[PDB]
Design a protein around this ligand. Structure first.
Ligand SMILES: O=[N+]([O-])c1ccc2[nH]nnc2c1
Length: 246
């Protein structure tokens, strides 16, 4: 009931992903409706959104959200491409669009493109009541200084959520990137409008418990509700969570 309590609460914070074909999206939606309850969302490729929305409706769980990704996984610095992709994500049906920050451009000293890209995508999401999450790719940024700066620029440009990772490079979330990023939320005073999402690095019920207690110590135990905290993860975190719940 410390581990059982936080396992329940983490499972309900999950953004469940594959690991995409039509038959796998389907099984995913089924995977997300568990016997102790539902993850908050699934996370899939935009093309698969209509089919997932249906599967989720048919199975009694319309309230499970559908999150998706754009400029992904590379985080190139073409704004037009990142924006048109975002516009289509929205048109497909997405509740949230996770856009990859142009982190290579920041590493080469250009902060402005990150700012304008995030902001271009936010205006379109906002217009459509879709959340805009920003993946900064901590495992490629690597330096605390760059993790901090990507995070701030994303927030200055209107990110509703900041996310460690794509899940497509070697290093996802670490306790340290996650802390650095949440510290930026705290340091800008934006806890009310910006949530956080580790991707990678949470594999066990005990991991999730650790990551949530970092948010709880920084902001109090009430902060990490589903709007402000998600575990971007896959079937195996979910099975560990469920294992610790019996
Ligand atoms: O922007 N997102 O709401 C969001 C949610 C779950 C994710 N998993 N991986 N990336 C993700 C982005």
């Amino acid at each position: 009931t410390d581990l059982k309590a936080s396992s329940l609460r983490a499972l309900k914070l999950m953004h469940l992903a594959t690991s995409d074909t039509d038959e796998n999206v389907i099984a995913l939606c089924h995977q997300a409706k568990t016997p102790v309850g539902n993850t908050d969302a699934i996370f899939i490729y935009p093309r698969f959104i209509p089919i997932a929305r249906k599967t989720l409706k048919e199975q009694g769980t319309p309230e499970i959200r559908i999150c998706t990704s754009t400029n992904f996984p590379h985080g190139n610095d073409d704004i037009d491409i990142a924006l048109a992709e975002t516009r289509a994500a929205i048109a497909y049906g997405a509740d949230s669009v996770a856009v990859v920050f142009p982190y290579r451009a920041l590493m080469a000293g250009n902060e402005q493109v990150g700012f304008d890209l995030v902001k271009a995508c936010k205006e379109a999401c906002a217009a459509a009541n879709v959340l805009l999450a920003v993946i900064i790719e901590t495992g490629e940024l690597k330096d605390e200084a760059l993790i901090r700066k990507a995070s701030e620029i994303s927030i200055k440009a209107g990110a509703d959520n900041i996310v460690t990772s794509t899940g497509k490079v070697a290093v996802g979330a670490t306790p340290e990137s996650a802390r650095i990023m949440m510290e930026v939320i705290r340091d800008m005073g934006v806890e009310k409008t910006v949530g956080f999402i580790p991707v990678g690095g949470v594999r066990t019920a005990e991991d999730a418990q650790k990551y949530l207690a970092i948010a709880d110590e920084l902001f109090g135990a009430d902060w990490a509700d589903a709007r402000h905290y998600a575990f971007g993860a896959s079937a195996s975190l979910l099975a560990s969570l469920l294992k610790a719940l019996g």
